[PDB]
TrEMBL record, chain A:
<comment type="similarity">
    <text>Belongs to the cysteine synthase/cystathionine beta-synthase family.</text>
</comment>
<keyword id="KW-0808">Transferase</keyword>
<dbReference type="Pfam" id="PF00291">
    <property type="entry name" value="PALP"/>
</dbReference>
<dbReference type="InterPro" id="IPR050214">
    <property type="entry name" value="Cys_Synth/Cystath_Beta-Synth"/>
</dbReference>
<feature type="domain" description="Tryptophan synthase beta chain-like PALP">
    <location>
        <begin position="9"/>
        <end position="263"/>
    </location>
</feature>
<dbReference type="GO" id="GO:0016765">
    <property type="term" value="F:transferase activity, transferring alkyl or aryl (other than methyl) groups"/>
</dbReference>
<keyword id="KW-0456">Lyase</keyword>
<keyword id="KW-0663">Pyridoxal phosphate</keyword>
<dbReference type="GO" id="GO:0016829">
    <property type="term" value="F:lyase activity"/>
</dbReference>
<dbReference type="InterPro" id="IPR001216">
    <property type="entry name" value="P-phosphate_BS"/>
</dbReference>
<dbReference type="InterPro" id="IPR001926">
    <property type="entry name" value="TrpB-like_PALP"/>
</dbReference>
<dbReference type="InterPro" id="IPR036052">
    <property type="entry name" value="TrpB-like_PALP_sf"/>
</dbReference>
<keyword id="KW-0028">Amino-acid biosynthesis</keyword>
<dbReference type="GO" id="GO:0006535">
    <property type="term" value="P:cysteine biosynthetic process from serine"/>
</dbReference>
<protein>
    <submittedName>
        <fullName>O-acetylserine lyase</fullName>
    </submittedName>
</protein>
<keyword id="KW-0198">Cysteine biosynthesis</keyword>
Amino acid sequence: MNVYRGVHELIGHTPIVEITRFSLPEGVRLFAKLEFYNPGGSVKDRLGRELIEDALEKGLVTEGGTIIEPTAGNTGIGLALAALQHDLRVIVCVPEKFSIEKQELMKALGATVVHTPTEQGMTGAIAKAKELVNEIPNSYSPSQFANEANPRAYFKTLGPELWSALNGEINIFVAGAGTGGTFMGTASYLKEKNIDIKTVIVEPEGFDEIHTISDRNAFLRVKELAQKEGLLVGSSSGAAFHASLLEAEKAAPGTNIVTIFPDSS
Amino acid sequence: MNVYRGVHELIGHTPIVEITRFSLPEGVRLFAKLEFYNPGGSVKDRLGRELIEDALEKGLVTEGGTIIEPTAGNTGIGLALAALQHDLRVIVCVPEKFSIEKQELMKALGATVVHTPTEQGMTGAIAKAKELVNEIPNSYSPSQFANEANPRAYFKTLGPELWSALNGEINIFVAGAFMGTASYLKEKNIDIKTVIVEPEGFDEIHTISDRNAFLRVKELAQKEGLLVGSSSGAAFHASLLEAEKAAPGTNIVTIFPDSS
């Protein structure tokens, strides 16, 4: 019975597609990991899911317990979904005027939203969270690091998915940076499997190699991907793609390039 | 290598998720097929894909040939994707003012857009397509039926996916305006209750209010973390109507066609 036991099971195992319609040099291949296939539309889901499961495994909280978050951080809807999976109440502390859309999203997903003062910002949100853990049994509140910037999730899931799908046939890894980037932990995982994997970080105009990509070039790649591969992606993917093409140019035969497309059009 | 050879391979084999957080009667189960997981975001991709492959198999065209469409009809981006896969050029014949957004999409996907007079509508679009087939070699233009309303695609793909994933353990099928999928399931088993969902504006039919669909949309988000559109909510409401009076052992399958 090939069925998903809940939406949380739809996190990860995102598609990898080979790019075959860009005239790359002999022996050169290129693969794009479509992280926008996550339920919330981004790779962030992976981090939210991981936040919950690590908190459990380490016994920081248990099923039926409560999760109190400083803001939604970079958890996508993965924290909400993994919380459902484990009968965990979600409470998000958030300064009143901060990220309104995300407040509505979290309410729609059943989380309780509490407002901290608008001027105390992130600091005040963390303040309320720690109080509530000191009022609630079976309670846990992640650090800002855990909530926003932890690479462990991608080390444990995204990395291994790439290695597996490609039978360890990987030479160059290319991904966007940032807390919202993928590079975190994925590049570390790949280096552990093979130190000869060239890790390439993609910087927007806002590791073995770094490529700084203009918005203009990312936009051009967005359009080309749509026209030639029918891949409707966002500017971050375009940027990653441009960076990947920079590598494929000077690649020798037998080179396999893997990049992450984090955003849809 | 678990790799997709092109985006066209991402059409279909959409997820089925079991709904387990709605207090359902004993022995009653409910499964939602998430068709919004298709590349273009809807089930229409399967029709456009099938259109191209049927045209090939029946030899109305070969790779390198040209596809001339009267409008984009109900093909989603599946016709564009299957065309890429088979080196087929796409030309869409659209009346000037008709579906502007779809024109921009088709251009982005690499198709050539030709305008027919707005007043001549579908007939003017069908008129021009016919011309161009009579001026292009390795050329094919689908009928409005083939382009908008053919259930064969879902008979061939969607139906079989549901049957396979659930090991033939299906009792009740619930979907909005169903063609093709319900036929396939009836063939597999005649005792499958097929239920059609009608929005306000075939063993059973349920007409669902916008209000009820909206309510179900919110409940799905809150209890299952499933962010869907009103068509799904409508299908879900209709499914719950069935599940209520279901006897144990009943397995219900519904299609969620739209995302939030």
